[PDB]
Amino acid sequence: STIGSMNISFQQPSMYLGFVTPRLNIPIPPRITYPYFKLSRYTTQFQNTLA
Amino acid sequence: MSNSAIPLNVVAVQEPRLELNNERTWVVVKGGQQVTYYPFPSTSFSSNQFN
């Protein structure tokens, strides 16, 4: 190949998030519940190769 | 002082070369410990930018 070899950098990366405070009159619960999923992987290599 | 037109108020002032009394208060200057300087070399410098 033409390419070999290559060099990769990174500089300080920022992170962007958004805090929305809410209105005084409407109150928000002391304790509250969110739906949360949780993903896992399982790999198993096999032989022999097919071609 | 109360000589002219609307009378004024009297005050006297001592010349600079002599007070010789006034109330002389010792004044301890204090500022927080640890003043330090950093040199932050720019992440992601370019030819048209500095960050």
Curated annotation (Swiss-Prot), chain B:
Cellular compartment(s): Virion
Signal sequence extent: none
Residues annotated as transmembrane: none
Top-rank taxon, per record: Viruses
Function: May self assemble to form an icosahedral capsid. Most abundant protein in the virion.
Protein name from the UniProt record: Putative capsid protein V20
